[PDB]
């Protein structure tokens, strides 16, 4: 029932994601010189370095907020390269499955700890 445990759990999950080769296209903001029409399609860019820096700055109140930003990385990838046979597409799908598999217990433990606190 530790209300604060999610933060270190998210730091460790982000470390695993950075070690994953599938995270390479998502480690830093999309380069607008390489993809000049990116902002014509994507309203809110997101990447794992921005997620990590938001977490380290103490700017996430809950793991649900972090999860919303990570999910935005994947939805941006799907919206920008929607060829279900593109390299980045396939990397996004595997990394998303890995993230969802590991974030589930982080969210469950946090929601349980908060429900216990407010009992
Ligand atoms: C990160 C993003 O959404 N766009 C950049 C990008 C990177 C790789 C590829 S790809 N499909 O050739 O692997 C297409 C676009």
Curated annotation (Swiss-Prot):
Phosphothreonine found at: 44
Compartment(s) where it occurs, according to its Swiss-Prot or TrEMBL record: Nucleus
Stretches assigned to the Bromo domain: 1-106
Record PTM Phosphoserine, positions in chain: 90
Expression tissues: Expressed in myeloma and epidermoid carcinoma cell lines.
Domain of life, source organism: Eukaryota
Disorder cited: Chung-Jansen syndrome: An autosomal dominant disorder characterized by developmental delay, intellectual disability, autistic features, anxiety, hypotonia, obesity, and dysmorphic features.
Free-text function comment from the UniProt entry: Probable regulator of the insulin and insulin-like growth factor signaling pathways. Stimulates cell proliferation through regulation of cyclin transcription and has an anti-apoptotic activity through AKT1 phosphorylation and activation. Plays a role in the regulation of cell morphology and cytoskeletal organization.
Protein name per its UniProtKB record: PH-interacting protein
Upper lineage: Eukaryota, Metazoa, Chordata, Craniata, Vertebrata
Interval of the full protein contained in this chain: 1316 to 1434 of 1821
